Amino acid sequence: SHRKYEAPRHGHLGFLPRKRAASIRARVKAFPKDDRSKPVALTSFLGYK
Amino acid sequence: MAHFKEYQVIGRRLPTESVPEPKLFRMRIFASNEVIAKSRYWYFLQKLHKVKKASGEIVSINQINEAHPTKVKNFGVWVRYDSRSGTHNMYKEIRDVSRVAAVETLYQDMAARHRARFRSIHILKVAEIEKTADVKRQYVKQFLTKDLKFPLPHRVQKSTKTFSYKRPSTFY
């Protein structure tokens, strides 16, 4: 039968699997869309919290 | 039913001492053999008069060939057909060479356009229209138009092999 009090989903499923990362250095899965008119520059940098 | 033929079937009561020489009813039957022809003869005569195969006799079964199997004719066919809900009469025009070919096309056309079957169809009359303008139907009249010509676009071959090397063409 049905839930009896319609409450919402605990947790976010698009953050699954909630597993260990392969490295401490996370992957940049995307860079900004390139504009072939501006100067040449880096899109990102590396630092330490 | 099959590739058709036309038979004339002549039939008779059995003679009694009371009434000898009965009246010799005949019918033109479209059928694929003499057995089916005699069956249909008795079907229709049973319907019309007090006769059956047991009290009756078949006097002669004769095949009727076309007198002119090369002259292209325009037949009109008067038909009776049982539908699912009801039974109906029809007049169809068929342009063909022979009565028997016309009847073949008629059975196929009624099966196609009315889902009617041989058991369901009675052919009342098949008649040649001698003069044009007595034709009632456009799908026949447009071939009686004067000096008729037309192409066959999109010509498709039939290939012996499975693979080809040309990317063929539908020319004509």
Binding site: - | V156, F163, R167, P168, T170
Partner: protein
């Protein structure tokens, strides 16, 4: 008959091509299908799109990673249609599907090679004119294939180079035809004409 048969999937119907291909495979012919983004399906684009959405909502409810995998590229759509026509859960079917190869576009080892067609699967011969048809690249892009632009760019490049090759080949063919034509008067040529050749 050839050891490897290269089929140009342009203008072709998916199910019919898959049928003849599957049978050729099981009978032992190595086949490679190319330019499968230009493959055709009968019925309008919206119809086939709804059909694919129906396929795409089918999934194992306790693990969609277990479920039926919905492959989005045209090559793998064709492979789906075709492994449904092979008994792929056996060794014979595995071997057949190893004889098979499918590609989007025409990659380098197979663009310098002759492409055959299959006339019992071509849409321009098999469909009635007026009947609406769908293109697999369009469908696959609608349902989530990304590399439509890339294949187009690369195919343009290929067509340029192939046209150059054909210009050269046509010139050489012209020369050979002129030479044979001037040679088609002598006694040897007359004897060959008598013998059919």
């Amino acid at each position: 008959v050839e050891p490897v048969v290269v089929i140009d999937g342009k203008g072709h119907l998916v199910g019919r091509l898959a049928s003849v291909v599957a049978k050729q495979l099981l009978n032992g012919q190595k086949i490679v299908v190319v330019r499968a983004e230009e493959l055709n399906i009968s019925g309008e684009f919206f119809r086939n799109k709804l059909k694919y959405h129906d396929f795409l909502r089918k999934a194992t409810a306790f693990n969609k990673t277990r479920g039926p995998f919905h492959f989005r590229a045209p090559s793998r759509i064709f492979y789906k249609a075709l492994r449904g026509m092979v008994s792929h859960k056996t060794a014979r079917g595995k071997a057949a599907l190893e004889r098979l190869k499918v590609f989007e576009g025409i990659p380098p080892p197979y663009d310098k090679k002759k492409r055959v067609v299959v006339p019992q699967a071509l849409r321009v011969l098999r469909l009635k004119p007026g009947r609406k048809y769908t293109t697999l690249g369009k469908l696959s892009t609608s349902v989530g294939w990304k590399y439509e632009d890339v294949v187009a760019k690369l195919e343009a490049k290929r067509k340029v180079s192939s046209a150059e090759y054909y210009a050269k080949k046509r010139a050489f063919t012209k020369k050979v035809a002129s030479a044979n034509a001037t040679a088609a008067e002598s006694d040897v040529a007359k004897q060959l004409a008598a013998l059919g050749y």
